[PDB]
Amino acid sequence: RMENELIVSKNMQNIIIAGNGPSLKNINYKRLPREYDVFRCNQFYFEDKYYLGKKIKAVFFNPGVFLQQYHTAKQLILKNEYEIKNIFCSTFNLPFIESNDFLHQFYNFFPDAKLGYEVIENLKEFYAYIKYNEIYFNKRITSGVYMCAIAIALGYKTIYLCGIDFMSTNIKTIFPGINCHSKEYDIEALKLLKSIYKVNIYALCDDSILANHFPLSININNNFTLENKHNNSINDILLTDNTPGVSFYKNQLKADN
Amino acid sequence: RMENELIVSKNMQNIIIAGNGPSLKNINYKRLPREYDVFRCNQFYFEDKYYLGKKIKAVFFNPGVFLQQYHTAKQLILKNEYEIKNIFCSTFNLPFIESNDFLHQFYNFFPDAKLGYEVIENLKEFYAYIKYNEIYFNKRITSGVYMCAIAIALGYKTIYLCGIDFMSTNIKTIFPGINCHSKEYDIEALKLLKSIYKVNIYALCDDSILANHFPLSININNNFTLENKHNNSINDILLTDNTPGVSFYKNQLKADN
Amino acid sequence: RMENELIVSKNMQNIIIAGNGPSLKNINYKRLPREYDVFRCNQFYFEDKYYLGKKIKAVFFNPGVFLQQYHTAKQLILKNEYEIKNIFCSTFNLPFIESNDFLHQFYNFFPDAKLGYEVIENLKEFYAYIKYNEIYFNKRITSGVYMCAIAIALGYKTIYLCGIDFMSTNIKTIFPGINCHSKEYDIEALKLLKSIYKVNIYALCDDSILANHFPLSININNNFTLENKHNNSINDILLTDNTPGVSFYKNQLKADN
Amino acid sequence: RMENELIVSKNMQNIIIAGNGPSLKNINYKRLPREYDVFRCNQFYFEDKYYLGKKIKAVFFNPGVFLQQYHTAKQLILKNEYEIKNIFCSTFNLPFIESNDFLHQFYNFFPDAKLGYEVIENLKEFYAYIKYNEIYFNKRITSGVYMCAIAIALGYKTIYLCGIDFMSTNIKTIFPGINCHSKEYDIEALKLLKSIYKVNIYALCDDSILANHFPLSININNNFTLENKHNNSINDILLTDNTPGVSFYKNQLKADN
C-alpha cells in the first residue's frame, strides 16, 4: 500500500514542507519548482482547499495523538481524499517526551508507520544540538523544522517552506481540559541545518514573517490548479472506538504522563 | 526431529488448509491436487478419521492453550498418530492479545516451535491491514485465514480450503468457567490475500458456505484412502502435570489476563 | 589469560568427562587415549590427588553457587593448582531455573566466563528434548551429561566417562539450612546424544554401574603419573567477602528464589 | 562537530594522559614527544593555565556528575576555552556502579558521547582482571589508569603520564552533604597493561611519586608555551537548570542510589 522506505533519487531532490499557519493559503504558486514531493503535518486535512494538492509524500504526527491521527490518515486514504506514501511519528527518543512503552510498542501497533528519530539521528551534529538545547534549555523545534531535518536526512537538497508562521472540537473531547518553542530557535535551527548539510531553503509566501529570514523562491511563472475540498471532507481529527486494543493503548498512555 | 525452517520448493507450491468445521468430513477427495502439503490447526486430532492423512507439514495453536497443545502434539508424534514437521503459535504481536512475558519467554519454553507473527509480518500490506482492523474495529481473522496468510508468506501459490464453516471436557477442566470473528471479515481478508499476493484459493467441500465464495477445485478424479483413527487415539487436549516448570508457566499466564 | 572460544581441531576430538563420584579414584588409566582434553565440574578440586592431571580444558559450575565457584577457580589458577582454559555456567535458559537478572547480568559480572545454554542450544533436537522433559516431566540431566552435550556441540567425537556414579562445610555456611535427576534419564539422554550426533561414548572405570551401560574403553596399556595434591590445596569452595559488589549480587539472588 | 569514532593512525601513537594532581603544574615539558594527543579527565578545566594546551583529544567524566560535566564541556567548547574531540563517560558496566537506567538511557541523553566500557571491554584479559578485583576485593582503578586502558584499547602504544599523584563549591551545591582506590592497585594495573598489551609508559614529572615506578621520559629538549587561562574562564563544574529534561534525569538518578 504505502512505501517501505522513502528513497530520494538524485534526479528529484525538491521538497515542499508546509505547516498549518495562515500563510498556507497565501502560497505564491509561481515560485514552486516544476518537480517536488510534499510533506504535511498534524491537522493538515483541516484545510478547506488542496493548497498543495492531494499527493503527500509523507505526513508527520505527534506521539500524543498518534493513535487518532494514524486512524485519521488511513481514512483519508480510504476515502480518496489524499494519497499518503509515508506516515511518520515526530519523535526525539527522549524518555521525558516519549514513554518507553510508547516507543517500544510503536511498531507493534503501527507496523507500516515510521519513528522519525531513527531518521534524524543520522544528522549526528544536528541531533546532538537539538537534544542539548531540549534537555538543558527547554528549547524544542516545531514540526516544520522537524520535517526539514527529516527531509535533509533523507536526501532532499532544496527546501521550500510555507504555512510556517509565528476544528479542535474533537481534540477537546479527546483531551478534556485546557513555552519550549520560539521563532528564534526555529530560525537558528533552520540556519544550522543549512550550513551543516549544505542545502537550500526558500520561502514561498510573500507576506510571511518567514520571508524576512529566508529568500523567497524565484517567480518562474509556475501555475497551480487550486482544488476545493469536497463537502463531506474529513476536517477534524477522528475519534476512536473503545475496542479492547484502543482501551489498552489509552489506558497505558494515560498511566505514562 | 522436526524442521528448522519450513521451505517451499517452486516445484510443489500446493497447500491444503483445513479448519475443524463439519465440512472436514465432506471433502471431495477427487478435487485434491496430486501433490500437496497439509496445515492443521487447534483440536484437529479430535477427528475420528484421518480425513487428510497422517502427515502434517505444520500445525497451528493459539497462545492461550499453547502449553497443553505443544505437549499434545509431542505425544501425537511419539505415539505415531501423526507426523508433524512444524508447530506454530498463531500470533499477531499485539500486547493486548499476547503478553510480553509470553512472547519474550516463548522460545525459552518451546525451542523448536515457531511464532507465527514473525512469518506473517512479511506480508507488509496484509499485516498492516489486519492490525488496523483488530485495533480500531475489533475484527480478527480466524485460524484458517491465519494459516492461509502463513502459507502465502512461506511461498505456497495455490490454496485448497476445507473445514472452514460459519471433546472440550479437558478444556473445561483447563478453564473452570464459561465477537471479533465474522464470516464477512474472513472472506474479505481471504480475497485481499488473493489480490495482493497473486495466489489461487479453491474450496474442496461441495456443500459448504465457503464454496459460494471460492471456486470448488476441479474434479480431476483424484482418489483417497480414508483411514480410521485407532481405538485409543488421543481425542482431547492433554492435561499437564503441576511440575515446577508448568506451575511457573501457568502462574505467570494467570497473572497476565 | 583463558580462551575466548573453545575450538576443537579435527586432529584431536577426544574428551575426558569426569563427575565427582567414587569411580573417579578407580579410573583404569590404561584405557585412556593418548591424546585428550579434560572437562571437570562442580567441586572437582575437593579431589585429594590429580586423578586427571592439572590441565583442565573447561570447568562447569551451577548458577546457584557460580559466584563462589568463579572465585574459587580464579584462585585455583593463581595458586598454580590447576590450569583452566574455560569456565562454563551449566544453564538451560529456563526462567524457573535461572532468574532473568542472573542471565542478563551474567557477563557483566563474569566477562570471561561462558553460559552453557548458548552452546547446547545448537543441538536443536537434543535441546528440545531436555526442555520438554524438564518442563512437563520434571526430569533434568546431571552435570556429567550436561558436559557430554557441551563436548558434542563443540566438536568432540569420542567421549570417555569417569566419576559418574548413581567438604560441604563452606557450603553449609553459604546455605544455612538443609528428585529431577535419575540414573535412567541420564543413560537415556546419553544414548540419545550418541544416536543423534554420531559420537562414541566409553566408560573408564571397570567396577562402575556406568560400565554396565557403556563399553569400557580398550586397554591400550596407557600409563599415568598420579600426582598427589599439595598440603594446603584448596579443598573446599571459597567464601566471598561482603564487598559492595558481592552484597549487591547476593541480595539480588536471594530475592529471586 | 566532534569525532564519531576516535581512530589512532600507526603514524602517531603517542598519548599524553593527565590527572589533576599537583604534578600537573610540574610537568617537564622537555620530556614530551614532538607528536601526541591529550586525554584529560574530571575537573581538568579548574586548571589556571593551559598546562597541556587547548586541544584535547578526549575528556573523561564519571557517571555521577556526567549530566553537569557534559554540559560544562559543551560550554568549554562554545566559549572557545578548549577544543574537545571526544567525550567519554568512565564506566565498567557493573550494576552496583552504574544503574541500568543510566546505561540504557545514556545515548538517548548524550548522543555524541561515548560509554568507556564498550572500549575497554575489548582488553579481555585486563577487563576480567579489574572486574574480579572490583567485585570480590573492592579495588577500583582511578581515572588516570582508566584512561590508559582506553588509550591502549584504542591503539596508542606509548603513554606519558602527569598529574597522577597519591572549586568543589558548585559540587557542594550539587551534592548537599559530605577506599577502593590505592597507589598500589593503580601501579599494579598499570604494570599489567604494560606487560599484556606491550606498550610503553613514561612519567613526565621529575618530582612525582609516579616517577619512582615508571621511567621519566627522555629530555629531548622539547619546548612548550605555557598559556595562562583567561579571567572569566570556567573554573568550576557548571550547574544545570531545572528544565523538564534535567528534573526527569535527576529524579531518576536519585532513585537509583
UniProtKB/TrEMBL annotation, chains A, B, C, D:
Highest taxon, organism lineage: Bacteria
Keywords assigned by UniProt, alphabetized: Glycosyltransferase, Membrane, Transferase, Transmembrane, Transmembrane helix
GO molecular function terms listed in the Swiss-Prot or TrEMBL record: glycosyltransferase activity
Name of this protein: Alpha-2,3-sialyltransferase
Organism: Campylobacter jejuni
